[PDB]
């Protein structure tokens, strides 16, 4: 039902920060906050991973340990957006990132198996 499109990707010099955004649509019956979400990436010749996620109920954080204490993950439940915040980017942080969703919630660091919802995708590319 929901259709979520990530914005954002871009060339970004090493060090430096950039945000993403992910705008969900559809599923007007269903409150935004109700949903879990994530960001995931894929760097060239990687499979997916998980970089972040924000638990519905409670709102816990969980982050993947290349990007604790660098990332930040929010969420604008007016605008039904995820937002995802990058500092200190390094040449490993290039990749395809991947907004998800899922009506359901997880307690540690979820994998891309926990999410129903995908986003096609932008890319982020830090040279």
């Known amino acids: 039902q929901v259709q979520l499109v990530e914005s954002g990707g871009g060339l970004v010099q090493p060090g430096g920060s950039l945000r993403l955004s992910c705008a969900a649509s559809?599923?007007?019956?269903?409150?935004?906050?109700?949903?879990?979400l994530g960001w995931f990436r894929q760097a060239p010749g990687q499979g997916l991973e998980a970089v972040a996620a924000?638990?519905?109920?409670?709102?816990?954080?969980y982050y993947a340990d290349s990007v604790k204490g660098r990332f930040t993950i929010s969420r604008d439940n007016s605008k039904n957006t995820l937002y995802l915040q990058m500092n200190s980017l390094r040449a490993e942080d290039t990749a395809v990132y991947y907004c998800?969703?899922?009506?359901?919630?997880?307690?540690?660091?979820?994998?891309?198996?926990?999410?129903?919802?995908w986003g096609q995708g932008t890319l982020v590319t830090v040279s």
């Open positions: 924000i638990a519905s109920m409670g709102g816990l954080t």
């Open positions: 998800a969703a899922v009506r359901g919630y997880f307690m540690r660091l979820p994998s891309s198996h926990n999410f129903r919802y």
């Open positions: 559809g599923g007007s019956e269903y409150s935004y906050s109700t949903f879990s």
